[PDB]
Enzyme design. Structure first.
Site, PDB file in Angstrom:
ATOM      1  CG  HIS A  62      -1.614  -1.252   1.495  1.00  0.00           C
ATOM      2  ND1 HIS A  62      -1.439  -1.991   2.645  1.00  0.00           N
ATOM      3  CD2 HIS A  62      -2.468  -1.962   0.716  1.00  0.00           C
ATOM      4  CE1 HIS A  62      -2.150  -3.104   2.562  1.00  0.00           C
ATOM      5  NE2 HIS A  62      -2.784  -3.109   1.401  1.00  0.00           N
ATOM      6  CG  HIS A  92       2.573   5.641   6.424  1.00  0.00           C
ATOM      7  ND1 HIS A  92       2.200   5.304   7.708  1.00  0.00           N
ATOM      8  CD2 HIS A  92       1.526   6.339   5.910  1.00  0.00           C
ATOM      9  CE1 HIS A  92       0.970   5.800   7.937  1.00  0.00           C
ATOM     10  NE2 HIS A  92       0.506   6.439   6.876  1.00  0.00           N
ATOM     11  CG  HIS A  94      -0.768   8.683   2.444  1.00  0.00           C
ATOM     12  ND1 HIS A  94      -1.582   7.575   2.393  1.00  0.00           N
ATOM     13  CD2 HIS A  94      -0.459   8.838   3.758  1.00  0.00           C
ATOM     14  CE1 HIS A  94      -1.729   7.105   3.642  1.00  0.00           C
ATOM     15  NE2 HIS A  94      -1.071   7.833   4.526  1.00  0.00           N
ATOM     16  CD  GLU A 104      -4.139   9.683   3.102  1.00  0.00           C
ATOM     17  OE1 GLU A 104      -3.808   9.649   4.294  1.00  0.00           O
ATOM     18  OE2 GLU A 104      -4.701   8.726   2.547  1.00  0.00           O
ATOM     19  CG  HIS A 117       0.276  10.111   7.452  1.00  0.00           C
ATOM     20  ND1 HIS A 117      -0.688   9.355   6.820  1.00  0.00           N
ATOM     21  CD2 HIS A 117      -0.005  11.427   7.286  1.00  0.00           C
ATOM     22  CE1 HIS A 117      -1.524  10.230   6.296  1.00  0.00           C
ATOM     23  NE2 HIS A 117      -1.146  11.491   6.552  1.00  0.00           N
ATOM     24  CB  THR A 196      -6.245   8.028   5.819  1.00  0.00           C
ATOM     25  OG1 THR A 196      -4.896   7.584   5.635  1.00  0.00           O
ATOM     26  CG2 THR A 196      -6.271   9.322   6.629  1.00  0.00           C
TER      27      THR A 196
HETATM   28  C1  LIG Z   1      -4.444  -1.161  12.124  1.00  0.00           C
HETATM   29  C2  LIG Z   1      -3.656  -1.954  11.046  1.00  0.00           C
HETATM   30  C3  LIG Z   1      -2.276  -1.304  10.913  1.00  0.00           C
HETATM   31  N1  LIG Z   1      -2.495   0.038  10.208  1.00  0.00           N
HETATM   32  C4  LIG Z   1      -1.867   1.167  10.880  1.00  0.00           C
HETATM   33  O1  LIG Z   1      -1.228   0.950  11.915  1.00  0.00           O
HETATM   34  C5  LIG Z   1      -2.024   2.462  10.311  1.00  0.00           C
HETATM   35  C6  LIG Z   1      -1.443   3.617  10.919  1.00  0.00           C
HETATM   36  C7  LIG Z   1      -1.612   4.914  10.360  1.00  0.00           C
HETATM   37  C8  LIG Z   1      -2.368   5.126   9.158  1.00  0.00           C
HETATM   38  S1  LIG Z   1      -2.540   6.609   8.595  1.00  0.00           S
HETATM   39  N2  LIG Z   1      -2.253   6.733   7.082  1.00  0.00           N
HETATM   40  O2  LIG Z   1      -3.880   7.079   8.906  1.00  0.00           O
HETATM   41  O3  LIG Z   1      -1.580   7.456   9.248  1.00  0.00           O
HETATM   42  C9  LIG Z   1      -2.952   3.949   8.538  1.00  0.00           C
HETATM   43  C10 LIG Z   1      -2.778   2.647   9.114  1.00  0.00           C
HETATM   44  C11 LIG Z   1      -3.539  -3.475  11.455  1.00  0.00           C
HETATM   45  N3  LIG Z   1      -4.902  -4.040  11.519  1.00  0.00           N
HETATM   46  C12 LIG Z   1      -5.593  -4.568  10.415  1.00  0.00           C
HETATM   47  C13 LIG Z   1      -6.940  -5.030  10.906  1.00  0.00           C
HETATM   48  C14 LIG Z   1      -6.951  -4.750  12.227  1.00  0.00           C
HETATM   49  C15 LIG Z   1      -7.987  -4.963  13.221  1.00  0.00           C
HETATM   50  C16 LIG Z   1      -7.755  -4.566  14.603  1.00  0.00           C
HETATM   51  C17 LIG Z   1      -6.495  -3.966  14.982  1.00  0.00           C
HETATM   52  C18 LIG Z   1      -5.482  -3.759  14.000  1.00  0.00           C
HETATM   53  C19 LIG Z   1      -5.709  -4.148  12.618  1.00  0.00           C
HETATM   54 ZN   LIG Z   2      -0.824   7.480   6.330  1.00  0.00          ZN
END
Ligand SMILES: C[C@@H](CNC(=O)c1ccc(S(N)(=O)=O)cc1)Cn1ccc2ccccc21
Ligand SMILES: [Zn+2]
Ligand SMILES: [Hg+2]
Length: 258
Positions: A62, A92, A94, A104, A117, A196
């Site tokens: 991603h 990370h 975007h 975003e 981010h 996001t």
């Molecule tokens: C959160 C996901 C892991 N994703 C992130 O940690 C994360 C952090 C920041 C952003 S952003 N771009 O907003 O800054 C996006 C994603 C794992 N995961 C997948 C399913 C799931 C279910 C319960 C707990 C964790 C889970």
């Molecule tokens: Zn992000």
């Protein structure tokens, strides 16, 4: 069949598997500078990354994430609108397929070439897994990237992209200083939102920096040569991995500056 940013599994389809996508505190949002409320009681941000331990960088299909050792309070974020200590776990980006899109969050409808981010979690909760179950579990420090001169501190990241070109690859990435990616000023806007990307959990306090950082055409170009696909599958360039602005509903954006 597992989310993505394509015509068939992109942002507009996420609600089918993740119902929270149409909730009340979803991110990202558009920052209307004339409606943001100056709040004189907000405190200065406190960024302490001097003992930051970077471990590795990896392509997860991603985007690419540089992970840090968060077993102890080495790199934290305090102050501002925050309550308690938040630990840096990963950062990370975007980005877009063109210089006029990528970010975003937008400011008065204007899009930047990309967005950084820096993700932190509330130490009060024990571990990241628990933090994602609370209303104030996360703090993401967002920084905008505009195309101009080169940013020294970003080059070390750019150089190693060739080794993590496709989904699932990773490379050891030690001794990286996050302080090289910060703008001069720490003025920010803040509002309560969500992740996001799926699971789109509403556990985030967003802190968006007013001042963006400059990066070169060559630096961003390199981001665009990454792959969404794992090794041996057809090639699909990693670009436009960003979610469109969501409605503010009943929230107010507070600014720390006049
Ligand atoms: C959160 C996901 C892991 N994703 C992130 O940690 C994360 C952090 C920041 C952003 S952003 N771009 O907003 O800054 C996006 C994603 C794992 N995961 C997948 C399913 C799931 C279910 C319960 C707990 C964790 C889970
Ligand atoms: Zn992000
Ligand atoms: Hg949450």
């Amino acid at each position: 069949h597992h989310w993505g940013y394509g015509k068939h599994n992109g942002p507009e389809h996420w609600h089918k598997d993740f119902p929270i996508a149409k909730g009340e505190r979803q991110s990202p949002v558009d920052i209307d500078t004339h409606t943001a409320k100056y709040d004189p009681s907000l405190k200065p941000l406190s960024v302490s990354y001097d003992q930051a331990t970077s471990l590795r960088i990896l392509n997860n299909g991603h985007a690419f994430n540089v992970e840090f050792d968060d077993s102890q309070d080495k790199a934290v974020l305090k102050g501002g609108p925050l309550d308690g200590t938040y630990r840096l776990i990963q950062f990370h980006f975007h980005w877009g397929s063109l210089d006029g899109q990528g970010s975003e969050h937008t400011v008065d409808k204007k899009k930047y070439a990309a967005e950084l981010h820096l993700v932190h979690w509330n130490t009060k909760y024990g571990d990241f897994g628990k933090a994602v179950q609370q209303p104030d579990g996360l703090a993401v420090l967002g920084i905008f990237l505009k195309v101009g001169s080169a940013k020294p501190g970003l080059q070390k990241v750019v150089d190693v992209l060739d080794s993590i070109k496709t989904k699932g690859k990773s490379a050891d990435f030690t001794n990286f200083d996050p302080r090289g990616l910060l703008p001069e000023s720490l003025d920010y806007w803040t509002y309560p939102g969500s992740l996001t990307t799926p699971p789109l959990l509403e556990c985030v306090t967003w802190i968006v920096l007013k001042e963006p950082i400059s990066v070169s055409s060559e630096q961003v170009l390199k981001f665009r040569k990454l792959n969404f696909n794992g090794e041996g599958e057809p090639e699909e360039l990693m670009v436009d991995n960003w979610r469109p602005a969501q409605p503010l509903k009943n929230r107010q954006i507070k600014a720390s500056f006049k």
